[PDB]
Design an enzyme around this catalytic site. Sequence first.
Site, mmCIF file in Angstrom:
data_model
loop_
_atom_site.group_PDB
_atom_site.id
_atom_site.type_symbol
_atom_site.label_atom_id
_atom_site.label_comp_id
_atom_site.label_asym_id
_atom_site.label_seq_id
_atom_site.Cartn_x
_atom_site.Cartn_y
_atom_site.Cartn_z
ATOM 1 N N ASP A 79 32.711 41.221 35.836
ATOM 2 C CA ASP A 79 32.182 42.204 36.809
ATOM 3 C C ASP A 79 30.715 41.939 37.042
ATOM 4 O O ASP A 79 30.006 41.594 36.115
ATOM 5 C CB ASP A 79 32.309 43.640 36.301
ATOM 6 N N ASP A 121 38.937 47.372 31.053
ATOM 7 C CA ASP A 121 38.219 47.522 32.302
ATOM 8 C C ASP A 121 38.289 46.189 33.056
ATOM 9 O O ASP A 121 39.372 45.807 33.502
ATOM 10 C CB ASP A 121 36.768 48.021 32.093
ATOM 11 N N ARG A 159 41.737 43.404 42.547
ATOM 12 C CA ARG A 159 40.336 43.034 42.435
ATOM 13 C C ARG A 159 40.122 41.556 42.208
ATOM 14 O O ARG A 159 39.628 41.154 41.143
ATOM 15 C CB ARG A 159 39.634 43.841 41.316
#
Length: 324
Positions: A155, A151, A205
């Site tokens: 984050d 993932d 990202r």
Amino acid sequence: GPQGYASMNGGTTGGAGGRVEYASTGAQIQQLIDNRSRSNNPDEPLTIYVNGTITQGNSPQSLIDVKNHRGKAHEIKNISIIGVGTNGEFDGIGIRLSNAHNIIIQNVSIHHVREGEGTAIEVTDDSKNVWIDHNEFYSEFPGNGDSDYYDGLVDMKRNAEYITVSWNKFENHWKTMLVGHTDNASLAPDKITYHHNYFNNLNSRVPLIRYADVHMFNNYFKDINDTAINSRVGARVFVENNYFDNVGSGQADPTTGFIKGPVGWFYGSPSTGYWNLRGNVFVNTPNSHLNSTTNFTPPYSYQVQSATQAKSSVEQHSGVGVIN
């Protein structure tokens, strides 16, 4: 201590000035956290020096749970997790901060995290005053071609705020960094600084930003396959004196129409974020389209190198084995 947003709201000292412990297994780390939380002094600063390889096999849960033992409704505070030399390694297990305040994570390598949240460091549930410094984060890219196999690397979600991410290497990964997991303004993090990081061989990202005010300065972006900074739903990112080399595919985004590159609005969300651009250097990186759409400047004092001075300092001093 940290420059930028983690220096606000009372500053970030992590576990300085308290107890010192060494741990070589995730079980020892988790037991230290949980034991303190149950004690008569749950807020006593705690520094855990990581010297060994933390794994799924030597940890009691699928992630390292920096969370109050009663539950996320209660704060956990004043911890530093610091690697020893080049030996502070988390292999296949990541760290989660939940409602964690005044936390330092420094000089560790966290990599190949699939299980748990599948992310190297997750900062969530209203965590604040967090400094993520001089670490190394990676998985594989392209690896087996599945962007979701691992993932994220770092984050931030659910109202996390006052966070500085500095002097880290982020490499070999698909979905690098998220700020805000859903288009829900009420859950948006805010007030994140990224500086002097090495972002290398990544797909996307870097970061994906929803809602938040973010300052990115003096980072070195290199070999980013699809897109780097993605500013969405009213985010404001001041992109200052960074060095970009081979960043972005140059293709029109099939959703937003924006040229895929160092900064823009890509992939999704109902409306754009904004960017303030100053002093960046772009090598083989689309940029002829690019103008500032916000005057946003962060509320703190700071020192900032030229982009080329930053490239060289990042090459020399980011990652592990530098501060310890």
